[PDB]
Amino acid sequence: NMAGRSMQAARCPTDELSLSNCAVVSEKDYQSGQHVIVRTSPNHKYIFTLRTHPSVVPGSVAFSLPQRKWAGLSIGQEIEVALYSFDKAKQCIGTMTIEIDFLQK
Amino acid sequence: SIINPDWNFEKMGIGGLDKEFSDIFRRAFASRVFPPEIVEQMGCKHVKGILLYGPPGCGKTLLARQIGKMLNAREPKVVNGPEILNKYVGESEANIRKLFADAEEEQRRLGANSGLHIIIFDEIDAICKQRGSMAGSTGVHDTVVNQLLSKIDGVEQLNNILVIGMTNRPDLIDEALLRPGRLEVKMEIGLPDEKGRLQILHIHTARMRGHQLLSADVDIKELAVETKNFSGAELEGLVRAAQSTAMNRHIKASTKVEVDMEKAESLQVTRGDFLASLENDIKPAFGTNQEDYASYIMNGIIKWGDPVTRVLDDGELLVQQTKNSDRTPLVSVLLEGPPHSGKTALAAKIAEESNFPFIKICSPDKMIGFSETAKCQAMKKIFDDAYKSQLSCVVVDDIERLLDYVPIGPRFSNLVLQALLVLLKKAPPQGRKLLIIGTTSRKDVLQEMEMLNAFSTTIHVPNIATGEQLLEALELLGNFKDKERTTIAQQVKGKKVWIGIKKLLMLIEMSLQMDPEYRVRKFLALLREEGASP
Amino acid sequence: DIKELAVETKNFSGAELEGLVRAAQSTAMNRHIKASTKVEVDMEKAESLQVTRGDFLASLENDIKPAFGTNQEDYASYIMNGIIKWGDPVTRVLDDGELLVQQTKNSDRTPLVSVLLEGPPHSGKTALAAKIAEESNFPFIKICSPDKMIGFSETAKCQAMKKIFDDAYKSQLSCVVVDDIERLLDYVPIGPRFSNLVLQALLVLLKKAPPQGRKLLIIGTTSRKDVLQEMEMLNAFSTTIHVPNIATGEQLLEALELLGNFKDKERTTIAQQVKGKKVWIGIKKLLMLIEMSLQMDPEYRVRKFLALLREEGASP
Amino acid sequence: DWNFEKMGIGGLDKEFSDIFRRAFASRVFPPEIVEQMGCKHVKGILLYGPPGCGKTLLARQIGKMLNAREPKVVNGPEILNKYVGESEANIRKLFADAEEEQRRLGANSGLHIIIFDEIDAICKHDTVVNQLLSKIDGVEQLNNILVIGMTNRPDLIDEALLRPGRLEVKMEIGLPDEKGRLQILHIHTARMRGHQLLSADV
Numbered sequence A: 001n002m003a004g005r006s007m008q009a010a011r012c013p014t015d016e017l018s019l020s021n022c023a024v025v026s027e028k029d030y031q032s033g034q035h036v037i038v039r040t041s042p043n044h045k046y047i048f049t050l051r052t053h054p055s056v057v058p059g060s061v062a063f064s065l066p067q068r069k070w071a072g073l074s075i076g077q078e079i080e081v082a083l084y085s086f087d088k089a090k091q092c093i094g095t096m097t098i099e100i101d102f103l104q105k
Numbered sequence B: 001s002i003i004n005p006d007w008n009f010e011k012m013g014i015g016g017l018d019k020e021f022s023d024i025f026r027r028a029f030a031s032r033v034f035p036p037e038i039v040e041q042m043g044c045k046h047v048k049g050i051l052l053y054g055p056p057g058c059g060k061t062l063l064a065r066q067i068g069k070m071l072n073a074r075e076p077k078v079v080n081g082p083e084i085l086n087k088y089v090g091e092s093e094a095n096i097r098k099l100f101a102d103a104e105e106e107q108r109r110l111g112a113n114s115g116l117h118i119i120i121f122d123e124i125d126a127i128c129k130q131r132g133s134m135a136g137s138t139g140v141h142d143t144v145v146n147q148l149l150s151k152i153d154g155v156e157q158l159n160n161i162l163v164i165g166m167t168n169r170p171d172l173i174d175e176a177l178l179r180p181g182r183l184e185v186k187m188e189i190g191l192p193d194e195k196g197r198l199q200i201l202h203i204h205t206a207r208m209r210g211h212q213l214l215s216a217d218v219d220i221k222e223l224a225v226e227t228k229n230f231s232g233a234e235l236e237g238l239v240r241a242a243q244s245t246a247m248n249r250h251i252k253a254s255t256k257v258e259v260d261m262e263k264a265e266s267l268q269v270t271r272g273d274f275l276a277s278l279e280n281d282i283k284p285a286f287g288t289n290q291e292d293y294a295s296y297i298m299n300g301i302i303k304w305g306d307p308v309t310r311v312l313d314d315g316e317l318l319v320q321q322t323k324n325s326d327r328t329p330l331v332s333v334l335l336e337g338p339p340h341s342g343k344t345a346l347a348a349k350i351a352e353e354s355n356f357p358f359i360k361i362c363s364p365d366k367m368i369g370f371s372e373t374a375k376c377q378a379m380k381k382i383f384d385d386a387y388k389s390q391l392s393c394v395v396v397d398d399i400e401r402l403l404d405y406v407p408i409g410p411r412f413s414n415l416v417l418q419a420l421l422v423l424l425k426k427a428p429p430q431g432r433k434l435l436i437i438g439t440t441s442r443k444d445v446l447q448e449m450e451m452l453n454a455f456s457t458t459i460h461v462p463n464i465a466t467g468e469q470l471l472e473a474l475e476l477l478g479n480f481k482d483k484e485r486t487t488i489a490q491q492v493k494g495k496k497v498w499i500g501i502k503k504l505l506m507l508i509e510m511s512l513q514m515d516p517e518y519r520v521r522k523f524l525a526l527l528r529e530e531g532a533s534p
Numbered sequence C: 001d002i003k004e005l006a007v008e009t010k011n012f013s014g015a016e017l018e019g020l021v022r023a024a025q026s027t028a029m030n031r032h033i034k035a036s037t038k039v040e041v042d043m044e045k046a047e048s049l050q051v052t053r054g055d056f057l058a059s060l061e062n063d064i065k066p067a068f069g070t071n072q073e074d075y076a077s078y079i080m081n082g083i084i085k086w087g088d089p090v091t092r093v094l095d096d097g098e099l100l101v102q103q104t105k106n107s108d109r110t111p112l113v114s115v116l117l118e119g120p121p122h123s124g125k126t127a128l129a130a131k132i133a134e135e136s137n138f139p140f141i142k143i144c145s146p147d148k149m150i151g152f153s154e155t156a157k158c159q160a161m162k163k164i165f166d167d168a169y170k171s172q173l174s175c176v177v178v179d180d181i182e183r184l185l186d187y188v189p190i191g192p193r194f195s196n197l198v199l200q201a202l203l204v205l206l207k208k209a210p211p212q213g214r215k216l217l218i219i220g221t222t223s224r225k226d227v228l229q230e231m232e233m234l235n236a237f238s239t240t241i242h243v244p245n246i247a248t249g250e251q252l253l254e255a256l257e258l259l260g261n262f263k264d265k266e267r268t269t270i271a272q273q274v275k276g277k278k279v280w281i282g283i284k285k286l287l288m289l290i291e292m293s294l295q296m297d298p299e300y301r302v303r304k305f306l307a308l309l310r311e312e313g314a315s316p
Numbered sequence D: 001d002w003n004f005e006k007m008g009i010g011g012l013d014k015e016f017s018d019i020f021r022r023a024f025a026s027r028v029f030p031p032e033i034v035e036q037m038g039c040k041h042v043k044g045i046l047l048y049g050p051p052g053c054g055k056t057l058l059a060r061q062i063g064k065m066l067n068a069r070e071p072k073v074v075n076g077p078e079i080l081n082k083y084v085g086e087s088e089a090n091i092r093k094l095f096a097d098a099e100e101e102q103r104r105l106g107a108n109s110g111l112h113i114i115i116f117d118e119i120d121a122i123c124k125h126d127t128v129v130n131q132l133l134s135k136i137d138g139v140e141q142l143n144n145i146l147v148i149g150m151t152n153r154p155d156l157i158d159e160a161l162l163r164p165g166r167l168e169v170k171m172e173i174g175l176p177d178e179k180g181r182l183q184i185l186h187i188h189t190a191r192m193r194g195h196q197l198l199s200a201d202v
């Protein structure tokens, strides 16, 4: 886990987890609340937060459609997942600016 | 090296030319300052000619006028190149005689204690040009140079004359006017760098800072940073537009316009004015044009498979090598594939993501009806404009439409092919960089022409070749819902397809005008005809 | 010393030995000028005026460029990254070059000499002719290349070539390089198509001797030799030299060691794979594949280099 | 805050404002303040578009708000009549009507608008182009002049004239959209509607 392991991208299992914006993983592989980094190539890394759902088969990670479009992930493709640790003394966020629009026209 | 006189250029109104001025003065004016005594004891004659070349708007005439005023002299005359040819013999000779007359009169009246009479030409690459050798179709025959040559040096020569010539095309000047004894010093004025832009901006906003008409949030370093490949005559236009924007807020519209007279007491120029003027008004001519990334990348770029990422990764490595390598200043690449596979959009995206300050596209859309003799000139000009920048990028679209290739015979242009073969292996001057991209759909023909030994590498843009990739593309476009997606996958997933992205979009658009219960069958009917077996 | 200045100004006209003196004088008077309001003469710096050697040397290096001399800033875009000894076929070429250079100067019964450099594309022929010419110390050297004649017509290239040759019959020992002979003829395999007006002028200018007592050497480079042989152009030359590709693993490793790019521990991994086969790659393409593989992360450079080499540079 | 209905122009809201801001916004301020800034006026504009879309109407209605004199209309083909002396001199007899006001009162002059139609064959002849370029730009020129050009073919126009210092403002006046047609119809049937001469059916 800490070193990094190969995983298979999957589809988000439930709408609630899709709205949670957290990658869905299996309990046997990780735990809820843990943050990971997903590598798709040498210059392509993305940080995600994990949530555990029973329906996820071991050895695969599920992402919602927005996550796949943002990270350029394709279902069935291989990725590298490595446990990620935050520096809370510095990386704790105070303010975010977010551009919001209607999801559906 | 040479100990130079100490000047300050903030009081003269010139910025960035800290070396051209020095050498010009040393080689053309360091002997007109000394007293005539030592000049006679040395017997040293005077330089009576200078040539200046560079892109427009970079401050050549300003330098000539300032130099003329520095050495107390009369108001310099002025002439134009193409103007003098508007007439024929018996009319232009009188015009020539009407320039040096005062100099001759003063030389007669005074002798060796006269005053310098500067003369300023313009576009001197027209009269002094027999170079009609270019282009299969071009002819020139002129005799206007010889009278000027005779006047400059020879019989009844004048010791109190000085001719300064200016041009934008240094390679069209005849070599008869450059020999030692007539136009002997040469200089180039180029685009300024960041320090020069800072100096120019500090010079052009000095009369408002005196009267406290400049706000406190206006920082000039950021303005210098944000204006890349700007001339000296466009920073002035930027300041003028930023001034005219602020004077509009203090006008009241009535039967006849008049000033506010109450909010006109705090007339200040703000950062907002400068930012708005940079977004709307000024458009540099050696900068990136952002109106050409909406006509080519029309429907974005979606990731339908693995091959759509290798291309982008390879394009990034080539950009990072044309910017960080010193053993390879010029690189080339060719994008190839079957028709409708999406080659122009990817090249445009790579160019846009490059981030270079100069980006240009050469397309056959702008040359409808042209002959080859004009296509060569257009392409050569597009390439010439790219050597004035320290980082460039040029795209060449539809290489097979430039040569006029038709399979019957076959036919093509052998005057464009050779020029294109020679321009792909010519490096830029000094230490400047360059990157060329090119898109084609017929690689075998290009191979038979020995045109693949000019490029450095190649990239293959493939078609959709599996059911899973087609389903992924449909899901990403988001047009057919799950009920119909299952039906589509129950049939397509059992075979292999051969379809481009452009054709897929066309088919999806065509099969959406039918009634809601026939669309899924119409789509498959169209797909079967277009491609279902390679 | 005026005697020493008469041995450095070779092929100078009389009207340039006058400009040299004027430039030196103007340089000498710059050290004694001042400008505060408007340029005015310093009244204590115009007395100890002494034109010195340094001014002459500076003016000779920077300001004066004879029209019948060697333009020492034009064989600098051709020999770009240098010359290195990856194998044997380099010394052979560089030695035949000096033998011909000595023949053209110490021989009385052959005032004209020609040579042709031919080989596969990208093998380093344009950067070898320039080196062979640069080390001859002839007063006159010129290069005729096709990239200064873009857009010209057939009748406008003959005039340019003939002018380049006519300027060389005014010097006591000359040298001319004709580059990319196949781009002057406008040759395209489809057809074929070419210019029969330039070919017939070239076939004649290669045999005409200069005036009595003068000497000339000509060097030409090409890559499609099988075409020039059907044109009967191989009878106009006196000799030919073959510039080869790299063709063994040991030569590749020696070439890599002299460029100094991959580490000692990164050169054993390459040697293990490469030293089990033969290769076919030119020195201009082995510098494009060592700059694309250095833009990767430090842990994937060797793999990328080997993949690039395999994809293109297989056996002949 | 313009009242476009009263002026008599509809469907041109972002063109009038931009033209006024860029070319005319400095000529309604006292010379004293304009001297403290160093600003220089603009002496050229180029308007192009289909024929009969409201380019002369705009030019003449913007020159009356400033309270200037009548614009001096001139045609393109007319100028090139025979040769130099009848055309070049005829060129001289246009800026001449205003060449005096500057040599009498200089600054505080009014502003002479010199409309100039076609401008697409005159500058493909070369005599007129050179004379005009020297008149507007150069060492000798008037600061109480504004030249407005109109064309229907934008590309043929030369590039030596579209540079800073020369004509440096370009505007396109195209066909109106739905709202433009609505506003034009509202403007052009206002007199009748006030006299109850327009039926309720309309």
Ligand SMILES: Nc1ncnc2c1ncn2[C@@H]1O[C@H](COP(=O)(O)OP(=O)(O)OP(=O)(O)O)[C@@H](O)[C@H]1O
Residues within 6 Å of the ligand: B296, B297, B298, B299, B300, B301, B302, B303, B304, B308, B338, B339, B340, B341, B342, B343, B344, B345, B346, B441, B501, B502
């Ligand atoms: N990888 C991609 N993913 C999604 N859409 C794409 C992709 N590449 C291109 N497109 C879009 O599909 C169309 C591609 O057409 P394009 O102009 O690239 O055609 P082309 O390959 O040059 O064809 P032609 O043979 O007609 O010259 C454009 O709408 C572009 O936005």
Ligand SMILES: Nc1ncnc2c1ncn2[C@@H]1O[C@H](COP(=O)(O)OP(=O)(O)OP(=O)(O)O)[C@@H](O)[C@H]1O
Residues within 6 Å of the ligand: C078, C079, C080, C081, C082, C083, C084, C085, C086, C090, C120, C121, C122, C123, C124, C125, C126, C127, C128, C223, C283, C284
């Ligand atoms: N030993 C060497 N011999 C030749 N060139 C070398 C050598 N070492 C390095 N180089 C460099 O390799 C490059 C090859 O030279 P060059 O580009 O002139 O080749 P070429 O055979 O003329 O190519 P092309 O077929 O494109 O005309 C040049 O940069 C040259 O400086």
Ligand SMILES: Nc1ncnc2c1ncn2[C@@H]1O[C@H](COP(=O)(O)OP(=O)(O)O)[C@@H](O)[C@H]1O
Residues within 6 Å of the ligand: B013, B014, B015, B016, B017, B055, B056, B057, B058, B059, B060, B061, B062, B063, B200, B203, B232, B233, B236
């Ligand atoms: N280096 C510079 N420093 C300050 N101003 C400059 C500079 N170069 C150009 N300008 C401005 O551009 C204007 C016109 O430039 P000009 O010298 O006519 O261009 P060109 O050299 O093409 O004739 C001048 O009024 C001047 O204020």
Ligand SMILES: Nc1ncnc2c1ncn2[C@@H]1O[C@H](COP(=O)(O)OP(=O)(O)O)[C@@H](O)[C@H]1O
Residues within 6 Å of the ligand: D008, D009, D010, D011, D012, D050, D051, D052, D053, D054, D055, D056, D057, D058, D184, D187
């Ligand atoms: N935007 C507009 N609003 C009102 N009337 C207009 C408008 N545009 C054109 N017109 C009318 O149509 C005619 C336009 O003529 P004119 O502007 O001189 O044509 P051109 O564009 O060839 O100069 C005039 O009668 C004018 O009243």
Ligand SMILES: [Mg+2]
Residues within 6 Å of the ligand: B343, B344, B397, B398, B439
């Ligand atoms: Mg295309």
Ligand SMILES: [Mg+2]
Residues within 6 Å of the ligand: C125, C126, C179, C180, C221
């Ligand atoms: Mg070569």
Ligand SMILES: [Mg+2]
Residues within 6 Å of the ligand: D056, D117
């Ligand atoms: Mg009109």
